[PDB]
């Protein structure tokens, strides 16, 4: 119920889903939406469109906070890397900064075995 105006949007863009979480500048979450909970399952959930719908719903969940400015942190290789950012600017927020925070091990742990499909 306290105003913030300066938040941070975190985009978790995996191959199967997109999670959008808006926090303040200290990491405290204010609201979230996901492509899977916006009415899409299966092959529809892992699309750029479903990611866009999630970005809108997240913008609505935090409209009480009076957020005006956003930094954007994108994480992952999924199809919702760009449509979520496009929708966050179309939602009225002023996109101040865009950053990739995808984790990269500097070697790290052995990955799972290759799939034989």
């Amino acid at each position: 119920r306290k105003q913030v105006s300066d938040g941070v949007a975190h985009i978790h863009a995996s191959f199967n889903n997109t999670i959008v979480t808006i926090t303040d500048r200290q990491g405290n979450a204010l609201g979230w939406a996901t492509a899977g909970g916006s009415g899409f399952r299966g092959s529809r959930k892992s699309t750029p469109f479903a990611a866009q719908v999630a970005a809108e719903r997240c913008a609505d969940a935090v409209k009480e906070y009076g957020i005006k400015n956003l930094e954007v942190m994108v994480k992952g290789p999924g199809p919702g890397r760009e449509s979520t950012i496009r929708a966050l600017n179309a939602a009225g927020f002023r996109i101040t900064n865009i950053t990739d925070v995808t984790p990269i091990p500097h070697x790290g742990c052995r990955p799972p075995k290759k799939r034989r499909v």
């Binding site: 899409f40 092959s43 529809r44 699309t47 750029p48 469109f49 479903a50």
Partner: protein, 153 residues
Amino acid sequence: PRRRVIGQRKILPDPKFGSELLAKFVNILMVDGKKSTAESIVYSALETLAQRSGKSELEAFEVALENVRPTVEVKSRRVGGSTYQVPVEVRPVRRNALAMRWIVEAARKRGDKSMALRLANELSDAAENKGTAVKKREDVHRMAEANKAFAHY
């Protein structure tokens, strides 16, 4: 076809009104090449529709079309894995071809007496977004809505 060598065929305008648009509607309604039998059915239904409203035969016909013409439809698209029903923009000509075909199909399914009366009741409900044809346009828009995510395949 593979070679794409298919141009266009000229259609004569209807006698009474000189509208090529209406002449195609007679063609969609015609069976067994009995065109005069279809011309009469369309003219009778058009007059019942002209006196059931205030507009001329054409303006009442266009208003019926505007409520049945689909704007977006779904077509299948088999790609590396499976097939998605992709929503595609319906080209302006196919809009009229689908609207007429659904009207004629809906009217043939009714249970009134003549076909001239059945066509009149369908053209009238189409002016009020009722009956089939209009509903068929609604079912198509819904399918294309539930697949908007696939609008890039």
